[PDB]
Design an enzyme around this catalytic site. Structure first.
Site, PDB file in Angstrom:
ATOM      1  N   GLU A 104      47.980  32.356  -3.988  1.00  0.00           N
ATOM      2  CA  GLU A 104      48.157  33.516  -3.076  1.00  0.00           C
ATOM      3  C   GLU A 104      48.346  33.167  -1.711  1.00  0.00           C
ATOM      4  OE1 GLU A 104      43.285  34.295  -3.556  1.00  0.00           O
ATOM      5  OE2 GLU A 104      44.266  35.887  -2.396  1.00  0.00           O
ATOM      6  N   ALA A 107      47.204  34.460   4.738  1.00  0.00           N
ATOM      7  CA  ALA A 107      48.176  34.524   5.744  1.00  0.00           C
ATOM      8  C   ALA A 107      47.734  34.021   7.320  1.00  0.00           C
ATOM      9  CB  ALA A 107      48.714  35.896   6.171  1.00  0.00           C
ATOM     10  N   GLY A 109      45.717  31.430   7.590  1.00  0.00           N
ATOM     11  CA  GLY A 109      45.426  29.771   7.477  1.00  0.00           C
ATOM     12  C   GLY A 109      44.067  29.681   7.123  1.00  0.00           C
ATOM     13  N   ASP A 159      33.047  19.992  -1.132  1.00  0.00           N
ATOM     14  CA  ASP A 159      34.027  19.757   0.119  1.00  0.00           C
ATOM     15  C   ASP A 159      33.879  21.082   0.727  1.00  0.00           C
ATOM     16  OD1 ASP A 159      35.380  18.256   1.987  1.00  0.00           O
ATOM     17  OD2 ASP A 159      37.128  18.767   1.021  1.00  0.00           O
ATOM     18  N   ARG A 163      37.542  24.011   7.103  1.00  0.00           N
ATOM     19  CA  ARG A 163      38.877  23.769   7.098  1.00  0.00           C
ATOM     20  C   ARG A 163      39.274  23.964   5.473  1.00  0.00           C
ATOM     21  NH1 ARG A 163      35.849  19.095   7.310  1.00  0.00           N
ATOM     22  NH2 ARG A 163      35.658  18.257   5.230  1.00  0.00           N
ATOM     23  N   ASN A 164      38.561  24.051   4.655  1.00  0.00           N
ATOM     24  CA  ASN A 164      38.726  24.587   2.938  1.00  0.00           C
ATOM     25  C   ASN A 164      38.489  25.810   2.826  1.00  0.00           C
ATOM     26  OD1 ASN A 164      39.791  22.123   2.679  1.00  0.00           O
ATOM     27  ND2 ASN A 164      37.692  21.287   1.818  1.00  0.00           N
ATOM     28  N   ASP A 177      40.824  24.654  -1.599  1.00  0.00           N
ATOM     29  CA  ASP A 177      40.642  23.022  -1.909  1.00  0.00           C
ATOM     30  C   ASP A 177      39.723  22.643  -2.941  1.00  0.00           C
ATOM     31  OD1 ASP A 177      41.158  20.410  -1.511  1.00  0.00           O
ATOM     32  OD2 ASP A 177      41.121  20.588   0.740  1.00  0.00           O
TER      33      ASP A 177
HETATM   34  N1  LIG Z   1      46.711  29.277   0.186  1.00  0.00           N
HETATM   35  C1  LIG Z   1      47.040  29.286   1.211  1.00  0.00           C
HETATM   36  N2  LIG Z   1      47.471  30.089   2.355  1.00  0.00           N
HETATM   37  C2  LIG Z   1      47.963  29.760   3.468  1.00  0.00           C
HETATM   38  N3  LIG Z   1      47.759  28.503   4.088  1.00  0.00           N
HETATM   39  C3  LIG Z   1      47.173  27.348   3.427  1.00  0.00           C
HETATM   40  C4  LIG Z   1      46.716  27.729   1.952  1.00  0.00           C
HETATM   41  N4  LIG Z   1      46.223  26.700   1.174  1.00  0.00           N
HETATM   42  C5  LIG Z   1      46.311  25.581   2.237  1.00  0.00           C
HETATM   43  N5  LIG Z   1      46.927  26.161   3.679  1.00  0.00           N
HETATM   44  C6  LIG Z   1      46.954  25.551   4.585  1.00  0.00           C
HETATM   45  O1  LIG Z   1      47.103  24.056   4.777  1.00  0.00           O
HETATM   46  C7  LIG Z   1      46.069  23.439   5.064  1.00  0.00           C
HETATM   47  C8  LIG Z   1      45.723  22.308   4.098  1.00  0.00           C
HETATM   48  O2  LIG Z   1      45.217  23.180   2.898  1.00  0.00           O
HETATM   49  P1  LIG Z   1      44.273  22.293   1.942  1.00  0.00           P
HETATM   50  O3  LIG Z   1      42.873  22.415   2.231  1.00  0.00           O
HETATM   51  O4  LIG Z   1      44.624  23.062   0.478  1.00  0.00           O
HETATM   52  O5  LIG Z   1      45.055  20.764   2.132  1.00  0.00           O
HETATM   53  P2  LIG Z   1      44.221  19.320   1.749  1.00  0.00           P
HETATM   54  O6  LIG Z   1      45.496  18.186   2.114  1.00  0.00           O
HETATM   55  O7  LIG Z   1      43.266  19.268   2.861  1.00  0.00           O
HETATM   56  C9  LIG Z   1      43.862  19.611   0.231  1.00  0.00           C
HETATM   57  P3  LIG Z   1      43.050  17.817  -0.390  1.00  0.00           P
HETATM   58  O8  LIG Z   1      41.940  17.823   0.265  1.00  0.00           O
HETATM   59  O9  LIG Z   1      42.575  18.074  -2.135  1.00  0.00           O
HETATM   60  O10 LIG Z   1      43.852  16.507  -0.189  1.00  0.00           O
HETATM   61  C10 LIG Z   1      44.782  24.426   5.148  1.00  0.00           C
HETATM   62  O11 LIG Z   1      43.906  24.044   6.130  1.00  0.00           O
HETATM   63  C11 LIG Z   1      45.509  25.811   5.463  1.00  0.00           C
HETATM   64  O12 LIG Z   1      45.784  26.146   7.101  1.00  0.00           O
HETATM   65 MG   LIG Z   2      41.665  20.958   2.773  1.00  0.00          MG
END
Ligand SMILES: Nc1ncnc2c1ncn2[C@@H]1O[C@H](COP(=O)(O)OP(=O)(O)CP(=O)(O)O)[C@@H](O)[C@H]1O
Ligand SMILES: [Mg+2]
Ligand SMILES: Nc1ncnc2c1ncn2[C@@H]1O[C@H](COP(=O)(O)OP(=O)(O)CP(=O)(O)O)[C@@H](O)[C@H]1O
Ligand SMILES: [Mg+2]
Ligand SMILES: [Mg+2]
Ligand SMILES: [Mg+2]
Lengths: 310, 310
Positions: A104, A107, A109, A159, A163-164, A177
C-alpha cells in the site's frame, strides 16, 4: 498427452504473484543503503479496484547475498499480516529481475521525515503546524495497535523507529520495515549471536547486554519513538557515541523528555523505560490507556477492538 | 559474490510449502476417478503442534492435463479460506512428484458414506442410531455456515453434495472439494459454455437451462443435501435417467420429501427449491432459522456469528 511433463513444469501458483507489466513506476520515494522504494501504480491487483496507487520495494544489483536473503525474508513475514496499522503487502513480482515487493502507498512517507518537515524552519514545510497533543496521542495509539498485532502473531520487530513508521494520506501511521522481524512463537524471545549492525539508540539494556529481543524490548523502542515524535525527530543521545550510549543505557540510563513534552507522553515513556523488561507495559495496555480520546473510526479498524484480539 | 545468480535461482518461498519428508502416509481414505485421498501424519506443519493427523490429496500419473489443471486450481482457491466449516488447507508439496495437498483430517470421511453407514442394515454400521432431528439440524447449520462463508468470499461451489461434505471426529460437517469452485466477484455468477460432466441431480433448473451458477443455485444443491441427509443418502431421482431429470427439473420438478422427514427439514427444502432463484433463501438466512437450537460451541466458531460477517 504430456501430463507427465506438467507436475515437473507448472507448480501451484503463488497467490501473491502479480504480473510485472501491471506495475507502472513513477518516482523514487526512498533510497536505503541497498534498497529502492518507488511510488507506482498497479492495474488490477486488488479485487474491485481498477487501479491502485502503490509503493514498490526492490534491492539494487549491488545487493549482497546477505541483503538478498534479508529482503527475501522480509517479503515472507509480510504475507502473514492483516492489520490496519501495519503496512499491507499487496503482491510480489518474482518472474524476472528485479524482484518487486508491492505494498500500500503511504503517501506522507515515514514518520521521521514527516516530523522533520513539520519543524517551522524546515525548507520542505507543508504549511500546517507541528503535531497537536491530540495527533500525537492518535499516532501513539496507531503504532501501539500495530505493534500489539505483531506481538499477537508472535513476532518481535526489533527495529521500531520513526524511520520505519509510515504515514498515510489520511495521516494514519502504520508499522513497516520487517527486515529485522523474527518469529518468537516457541520461546517468546529471539537471541542474536554477536555481529550485525543494529542501531543501539533504539535498543533495550538487556538487548545491548545479551542480544535478547522480546516484545518488551520493542516497548523500549516504542518509548524512543514517542521521544522522536515529541522532539520532531531529533537524534536520540546527540553528541554521544554509539559506544557511549551502549554503556549508559546498560547502566540504567535513558533519554530526557524533550522540551515542553506533554505530561501524558512523558508518562508513557517512563513506563517504556523501566529497566526490568517485565515491568514495561504491553502494547495492548498502551492502546488501552489511550482509547478514550481517539478518532471515532479507531474502534472500527483497530486490532485492539477486533475479535481476533481474543 | 554470486548475488547476481540469486534472484534468478531462489524465489520468495511459498508459505504453504511443506517439505515432503514431513509427511507420513498411512492408508487410502478414498479413490476418486483420478484422485487419491490418503490418511497421513505430518511433523511440524502447525505451529505449536508437534504432529498433526492429516488428509493428503494427490492425482495419479494417469491424470489428464485437464485433471491436473483442475487439481491445481482446487489447490489455489483453498489457500484463501479460513472457516471452521470449510475443510482447511494445511500445506502443499510441490517440490517433486507427486504433488500433495495436505488438509485437516476429517476422521469420519464424507457425509454420504457416513449416512449410508448409519442405515440399520449397513454392513459397516458403527453401533449408533441414525441421525436424530437435533443432529440433522446441527449438520444443516454447519453446512450452510460454510457455504455462507464461501459466498461472502464471492465463490460459488457448484458441486455441493453429501459426497463433498466431510465429517470430523467430533461429527462436525465442513464443505470440501473445490475443484468446481469459481470466482464470482465481478458478476455474481459463473456461466459455463456447454460440455463438462456435472451431476444434473444436484443442479438448479436455471443451471440446467443456461449453465448459470450462482449462490442461489448452491442453495438448490443444499436442499438436495438435506434430502440425502433425511433419506440416509439414497440416489436422488432413482429410476430416472440424467436426461429425464434434466427435463423434469427444468419444467418445475423437484424431489419428494423422504419418508418420515421432519417438518422442519421439509420447510427448508421448499425454500431451497423455489423455481425463481431470487426467491430462495441465502445461506446466512438458513443459519439464522437454525441458530437457537445448536450446540453451545456454534457461536464461538461460526462464520455467521463472527465479526467478519460484517
Ligand atoms: N509503503 C510505503 N509507502 C511510501 N513510502 C515508503 C513505503 N515504504 C518505504 N517508504 C519510504 O522509503 C523509505 C525506506 O523505507 P523502508 O524502511 O522500507 O526502507 P529500508 O531501506 O530502511 C528497509 P531495511 O531496513 O529492511 O533495509 C521510508 O523511510 C519511506 O519514506
Ligand atoms: Mg527502514
Ligand atoms: N480432508 C479429508 N479427510 C478425510 N477424508 C477425506 C478428506 N477429503 C476427502 N476425503 C475422502 O475421500 C473422498 C474423496 O474426496 P474428494 O471429494 O476431495 O475427492 P474427489 O475425487 O471427489 C475431488 P474432485 O471432485 O475435485 O475430483 C471423500 O468422499 C472422503 O471420504
Ligand atoms: Mg535500507
Ligand atoms: Mg474425483
Ligand atoms: Mg468429491
Amino acid at each position: 498427452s504430456a501430463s507427465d511433463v506438467f507436475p515437473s513444469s507448472v507448480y501451484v501458483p503463488d497467490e501473491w504473484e502479480v504480473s510485472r507489466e501491471k506495475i507502472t513506476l513513477l518516482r523514487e520515494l526512498g533510497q536505503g543503503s541497498f534498497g529502492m522504494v518507488y511510488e507506482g501504480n498497479a492495474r488490477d491487483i486488488i479485487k474491485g479496484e481498477a487501479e491502485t496507487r502503490v509503493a514498490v520495494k526492490t534491492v539494487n544489483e549491488s545487493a549482497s547475498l546477505r541483503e538478498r536473503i534479508e529482503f527475501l525474508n522480509e517479503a515472507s513475514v509480510m504475507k502473514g499480516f492483516t492489520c490496519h496499522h501495519v503496512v499491507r503487502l499487496l503482491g510480489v513480482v518474482s518472474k524476472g529481475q528485479p524482484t518487486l515487493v508491492v505494498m500500500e502507498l503511504m503517501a506522507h512517507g515515514d514518520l521521521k521525515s514527516y516530523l522533520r518537515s513539520l519543524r517551522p524552519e524546515a525548507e520542505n514545510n507543508p504549511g500546517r503546524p507541528p503535531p497537536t497533543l491530540q495527533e500525537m496521542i492518535q499516532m501513539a495509539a496507531e503504532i501501539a495497535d500495530g505493534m500489539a498485532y505483531l506481538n499477537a502473531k508472535k513476532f518481535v520487530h526489533r527495529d521500531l523507529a520513526a524511520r520505519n513508521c509510515m504515514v498515510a494520506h489520511d495521516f494514519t501511521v502504520k508499522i513497516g520495515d520487517f527486515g529485522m522481524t523474527r518469529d518468537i512463537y516457541e520461546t517468546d524471545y529471539y537471541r542474536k549471536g554477536g555481529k550485525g549492525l543494529l542501531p543501539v539508540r533504539w535498543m533495550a539494556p538487556e538487548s545491548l547486554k545479551d542480544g535478547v529481543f522480546t516484545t518488551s524490548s520493542d516497548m523500549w523502542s516504542f518509548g524512543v519513538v514517542l521521544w522522536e515524535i515529541t522532539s520532531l525527530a531529533e537524534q536520540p543521545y546527540q553528541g554521544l557515541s554509539n559506544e557511549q550510549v551502549l554503556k549508559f543505557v546498560m547502566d540504567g540510563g535513558y533519554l530526557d523528555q524533550p522540551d515542553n513534552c506533554p505530561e501524558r507522553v512523558t508518562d508513557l515513556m517512563r513506563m517504556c523505560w523501566q529497566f526490568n523488561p517485565n515491568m514495561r507495559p504491553t502494547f495492548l495496555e498502551i492502546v488501552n490507556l489511550l482509547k478514550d480520546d481517539l478518532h471515532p473510526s479507531f474502534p472500527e479498524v483497530s486490532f485492539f477492538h477486533s475479535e481476533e484480539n481474543k
